[PDB]
Amino acid sequence: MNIVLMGLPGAGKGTQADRIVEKYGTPHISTGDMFRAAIQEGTELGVKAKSFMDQGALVPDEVTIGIVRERLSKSDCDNGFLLDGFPRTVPQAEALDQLLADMGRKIEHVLNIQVEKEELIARLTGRRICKVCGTSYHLLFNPPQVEGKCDKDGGELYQRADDNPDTVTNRLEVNMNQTAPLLAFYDSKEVLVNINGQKDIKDVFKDLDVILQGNGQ
Ligand SMILES: Nc1ncnc2c1ncn2[C@@H]1O[C@H](COP(=O)(O)OP(=O)(O)OP(=O)(O)OP(=O)(O)OP(=O)(O)OC[C@H]2O[C@@H](n3cnc4c(N)ncnc43)[C@H](O)[C@@H]2O)[C@@H](O)[C@H]1O
Ligand SMILES: [Zn+2]
């Protein structure tokens, strides 16, 4: 289906994304991941993006919408898709509506994973990423089976440069600044669903599953 996983930095979007892909096998589209790739590719876009990313600020809308416009217009998204960490602003939200309006489609579910700020901060403090697949772990709450090695590919784990305290507080503030309105936009569009993310990973997924697995509740 056409899904959108939103939530503040550290809400467990990627974490829950890996589980949603397994089951339904829908294309995981993460703007955070795409920018990170452009950067690793060394593109001009990646150079300009990193500047904002390092600071913890949003990458300008026009650039962000642009890359999402291109990625979603690809064939591996006709049967469905899982946007992750997008949109984050109202312009992004509308640009996404029109984009799909042309393809004769629409967003069908906006899953908003909610967690209090303090938990969000603890989650980003001791987090680690797999050098090989991008997946994350948490030294305390969700450690890898074997220290420093990804459970999927044995890849090395590392801390995101921006997962430091200063940047984290700026990241949380900037993104929240856009939330309330973005949440209303979707709620008045009858597609939003809040979900308690302040629980075990498995349990947060079941709450997500209920909506994806259609069947009433
Ligand atoms: N649309 C857009 N517009 C403008 N700019 C944009 C943009 N999109 C991206 N950008 C730019 O790119 C930058 C980086 O983007 P991005 O990579 O998307 O950064 P982010 O916003 O900080 O979000 P995260 O992916 O890091 O968090 P997440 O919720 O997936 O967390 P995770 O699952 O690891 O979970 C966190 C930790 O918690 C643990 N965890 C997960 N679930 C649980 C649970 N249930 N209980 C306890 N711990 C848990 C995990 O193990 C992990 O260690 C942005 O700051 C911005 O500059
Ligand atoms: Zn990995």
Swiss-Prot record:
PROSITE patterns: ADENYLATE_KINASE (PS00113). It is found in: Cytoplasm. Its EC number is 2.7.4.3. Monomer. GO terms for cellular component: cytoplasm. It comes from the Bacteria. Zn(2+) binds at residues 130, 133, 150, 153. Optimum temperature is 35 degrees Celsius. Thermal denaturation midpoint (Tm) is 43.3 degrees Celsius and is raised to 60.4 degrees Celsius when AK is complexed with the inhibitor Ap5A. Gene3D superfamilies: P-loop containing nucleotide triphosphate hydrolases (3.40.50.300). ATP binds at residues 10-15, 127, 136-137, 199. GO terms for molecular function: adenylate kinase activity; ATP binding; zinc ion binding. Belongs to the adenylate kinase family. AMP binds at residues 31, 36, 57-59, 85-88, 92, 160, 171. It catalyses: AMP + ATP = 2 ADP. This is Adenylate kinase. The keyword Hydrolase does not apply. GO terms for biological process: AMP salvage. Residues 30-59 are annotated as: NMP. Its main location: cytoplasm. Keywords: ATP-binding, Cytoplasm, Kinase, Metal-binding, Nucleotide biosynthesis, Nucleotide-binding, Transferase, Zinc. Consists of three domains, a large central CORE domain and two small peripheral domains, NMPbind and LID, which undergo movements during catalysis. The LID domain closes over the site of phosphoryl transfer upon ATP binding. Assembling and dissambling the active center during each catalytic cycle provides an effective means to prevent ATP hydrolysis. Some bacteria have evolved a zinc-coordinating structure that stabilizes the LID domain. Pathway: Purine metabolism; AMP biosynthesis via salvage pathway; AMP from ADP: step 1/1. Catalyzes the reversible transfer of the terminal phosphate group between ATP and AMP. Plays an important role in cellular energy homeostasis and in adenine nucleotide metabolism. Residues 126-163 are annotated as: LID. The keyword Cytoplasm applies.
